[PDB]
């Protein structure tokens, strides 16, 4: 599948990074990093949280933006009222890197989500070492035992897992794994194509934070997700392509007013 191809590339890239920066070294770096921010507290703040994303490109969109200065973009995001900044760090298909994560972490006070394809423990310590407070885990990409393992390790480092699902059954798996935050991706990663959040959201325990991860083109989309019980929404394409990201974020942040 499309997701399979991405994971194959990811596993090779992770292995090459590990050859130059050992697991022992990255574990030490993670342990030495300032503790992660309380992501759950951020997600529980009043109002629909906007998770604004740094993303240069994607399999579905192709090239979106050059983003020569991801730190400056993230600063605009925070200025606009974003709750969390998402930073894509996958290089082959999204043209992101850990350098983007470093830049953003140094530039904003809000929590930072590492958006990548996490398949092994190295990437978790790596995320923490580079200042991530939140880490994406993709149910479609992970066998249940692996998902549970990855989630446990994420939380052991003080980070919050954004557990991404595309189906009700995946939502059920996520809950069983101990997910406290569930994101719904309207895109099928196998093929790149729902009505998803609305179908899936109602079934989640009230205690679990619900995030709509895609399809936000403006306030109307955000409000529709909110009406279906979203606690936050993730927005990338519409922001990275904006000439005025601060204003575009502020518009979404104040949606419904
Ligand atoms: N936006 C995305 C998030 C995850 C993924 F596997 C592919 C895309 C892209 O749009 O095809």
């Amino acid at each position: 599948t499309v997701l399979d191809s991405i994971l194959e590339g990811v596993r090779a890239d992770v292995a090459a990074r590990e050859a130059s920066v050992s697991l022992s070294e990255i574990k030490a770096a993670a342990a030495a990093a300032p503790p992660p921010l309380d992501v759950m507290a951020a997600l529980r703040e009043p109002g629909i949280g906007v998770i604004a994303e740094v993303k240069r490109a994607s399999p579905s969109a192709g090239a979106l933006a050059t983003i020569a200065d991801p730190a400056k973009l993230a600063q605009a995001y925070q200025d606009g009222g974003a709750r969390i900044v998402s930073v894509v760090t996958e290089q082959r298909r999204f043209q992101g890197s850990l350098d983007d994560l470093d830049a953003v972490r140094a530039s904003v006070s809000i929590p930072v989500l590492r958006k990548d394809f996490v398949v092994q423990p190295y990437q978790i310590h790596e995320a923490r070492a580079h200042g991530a407070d939140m880490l994406l885990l993709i149910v479609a990409a992970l066998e249940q035992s692996v998902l549970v393992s990855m989630l446990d390790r994420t939380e052991s480092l003080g980070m919050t897992a954004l557990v991404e699902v595309h189906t009700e059954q995946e939502a059920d798996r996520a809950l069983k794994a101990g997910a406290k935050v569930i994101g719904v991706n309207a895109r099928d990663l196998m093929t790149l194509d729902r009505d998803c959040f609305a179908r899936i959201a109602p079934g989640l325990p009230s205690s679990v934070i619900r995030i709509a991860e895609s399809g936000v083109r403006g306030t109307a989309d955000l409000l529709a997700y909110a009406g279906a019980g979203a606690d936050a929404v993730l927005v990338g394409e519409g922001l990275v392509t904006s000439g005025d990201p601060r204003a575009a974020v502020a518009d979404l942040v104040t949606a419904g007013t």
Side-chain angles (χ1 to χ4, degrees), residues 1-7 9-192 194-206 208-257:
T1 65
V2 170
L3 181 57
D4 286 329
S5 181
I6 297 179
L7 298 184
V10 168
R11 296 186 185 273
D13 291 344
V14 172
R17 295 205 297 278
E18 182 168 2
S20 304
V21 181
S22 73
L23 178 65
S24 295
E25 282 165 333
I26 206 64
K27 283 181 171 176
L37 306 167
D38 187 345
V39 175
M40 300 299 289
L43 290 166
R44 296 192 166 116
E45 290 184 2
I48 304 296
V50 175
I51 305 177
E53 181 165 276
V54 178
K55 176 169 59 176
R56 290 190 184 88
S58 69
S60 75
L64 289 160
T66 299
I67 316 183
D69 195 344
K72 184 179 292 291
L73 179 56
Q75 283 167 332
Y77 286 171
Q78 179 170 310
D79 277 343
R83 191 77 55 82
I84 296 174
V85 180
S86 175
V87 182
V88 175
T89 57
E90 201 288 319
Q91 171 66 34
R92 301 189 187 202
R93 302 310 303 277
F94 296 81
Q95 296 175 19
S97 78
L98 281 166
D99 290 357
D100 298 329
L101 181 57
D102 297 344
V104 168
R105 168 74 292 155
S107 79
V108 303
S109 292
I110 50 178
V112 174
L113 160 67
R114 180 182 185 186
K115 196 94 171 305
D116 203 331
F117 299 82
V118 173
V119 292
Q120 62 188 104
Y122 184 93
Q123 288 166 293
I124 303 176
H125 296 272
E126 187 180 56
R128 183 78 286 280
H130 289 266
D133 309 294
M134 198 185 203
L135 186 59
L136 187 75
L137 297 180
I138 300 166
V139 175
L142 304 177
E143 182 266 324
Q144 189 70 1
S145 86
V146 182
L147 170 62
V148 171
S149 168
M150 298 297 101
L151 196 154
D152 286 344
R153 183 173 301 261
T154 297
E155 297 182 337
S156 78
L157 298 180
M159 291 184 299
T160 288
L162 187 37
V163 182
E164 170 176 311
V165 310
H166 181 67
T167 73
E168 291 192 323
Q169 296 199 279
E170 290 187 355
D172 289 339
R173 290 189 42 207
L175 292 165
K176 285 298 177 182
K180 298 161 188 56
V181 180
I182 291 182
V184 180
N185 196 348
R187 198 179 320 265
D188 185 334
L189 301 190
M190 247 66 62
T191 56
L192 300 189
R194 65 104 230 168
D195 268 304
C196 275
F197 184 86
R199 290 198 301 240
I200 294 169
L204 306 174
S206 57
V208 171
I209 302 288
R210 301 103 170 275
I211 300 184
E213 284 186 63
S214 57
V216 177
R217 300 161 291 194
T219 70
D221 290 313
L222 184 155
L223 287 171
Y225 284 140
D231 294 303
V233 301
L234 188 152
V235 190
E237 294 181 353
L239 297 182
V240 304
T241 57
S242 182
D244 197 344
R246 180 183 170 172
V249 169
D251 171 57
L252 297 174
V253 170
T254 60
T257 70

